[PDB]
Design a protein around this ligand. Structure first.
Ligand SMILES: Cn1cnc(COC(=O)N[C@H]2CCc3c(C(=O)Nc4ccc(F)c(Cl)c4)ccc(F)c32)n1
Ligand SMILES: Cn1cnc(COC(=O)N[C@H]2CCc3c(C(=O)Nc4ccc(F)c(Cl)c4)ccc(F)c32)n1
Ligand SMILES: Cn1cnc(COC(=O)N[C@H]2CCc3c(C(=O)Nc4ccc(F)c(Cl)c4)ccc(F)c32)n1
Lengths: 143, 137
């Protein structure tokens, strides 16, 4: 009966990240490509660097495990579309969680946590303003 | 792809933990229970506390997502649960044990114990002392 919030220690919460709609978040493919492109040397490094790095390290690997289970279904699980349904669960339902988690951490390193959090409410408020009055410019993430 | 080692930032490797045999590690139920008993308050806290705390936090939750998925397949299809607890179980048993033990007794102590144990257990019956080396504060 323990309840740990992956975001608590970084000044956010699961409720908060779910304020951004599903379709705001980049893909997992695109997210890992970006972590590598901007951070491989630090993630692969033997320094802590930041708490963010530590967490990101763990989430890439954890997504890894979920993906190596997804490959293992089929190549070991005999039945046909009862195999596809599992790999479909993995890539859409859990994938959303990790899309949230990875975004949060790459975006925090790239842009700074306090800037990430402000952009988060600002986009959530903005996107929910209906088209009728919602400005052309969604707010921006920068630095 | 990049090759990240979850142990590297704490001065060990996946290789080095595999030195300890499968049956050295407690069960996951037993590991999570100890995490809670010894650390619930720090793990649920809003401070980082330490890199070990940060990583362990993520591992518990990760194991949780795998259980979540495992409970899901049983009720949404008709096992896959064989693989989750046999193959993947061990990896999290290693990772959970490593971080809990590092916080409990100290990284450098854990690493000394880990080599001394792997050597000791490999010394065959005929000559292995009956008393294994000890892990303690
Ligand atoms: C050039 N510049 C300087 N500052 C800015 C930022 O501007 C915006 O994007 N404004 C947005 C804010 C939300 C909103 C609403 C609104 O009422 N939104 C809303 C949506 C959902 C809610 F739940 C609530 Cl309470 C309010 C109506 C009109 C708006 F223009 C805006 N640009
Ligand atoms: C002064 N100024 C004017 N424009 C700018 C820069 O504007 C951009 O084009 N910013 C982009 C960068 C990505 C991003 C995201 C985002 O979510 N990015 C993201 C973060 C982490 C990731 F891993 C990935 Cl794959 C994407 C959300 C909103 C954005 F506006 C922007 N400065
Ligand atoms: C001379 N002396 C001084 N103290 C003592 C008595 O100490 C013990 O009985 N040590 C035990 C403590 C647990 C443990 C483990 C272990 O790794 N346990 C473990 C670690 C982390 C966990 F999360 C869990 Cl559930 C179990 C491995 C070897 C051990 F010897 C001991 N004699």
């Amino acid at each position: 009966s323990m309840d740990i919030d992956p975001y608590k220690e970084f000044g956010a919460t699961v409720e908060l990240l779910s304020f951004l709609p599903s379709d705001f978040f980049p893909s997992v493919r695109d997210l890992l490509d970006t972590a590598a492109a901007l951070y491989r040397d630090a993630l692969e490094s033997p320094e802590h660097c930041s708490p963010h790095h530590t967490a990101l390290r763990q989430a890439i690997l954890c997504w890894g495990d979920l993906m190596t289970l997804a490959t293992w279904v089929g190549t070991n699980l005999e039945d046909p579309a009862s195999r596809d349904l599992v790999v479909s669960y993995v890539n859409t339902n859990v994938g959303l969680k990790f899309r949230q988690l990875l975004w949060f951490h790459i975006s925090c390193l790239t842009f700074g946590r306090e800037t990430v959090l402000e952009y988060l409410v600002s986009f959530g408020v903005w996107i929910r303003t209906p088209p009728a009055a919602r400005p052309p410019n969604a707010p921006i993430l920068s630095t």
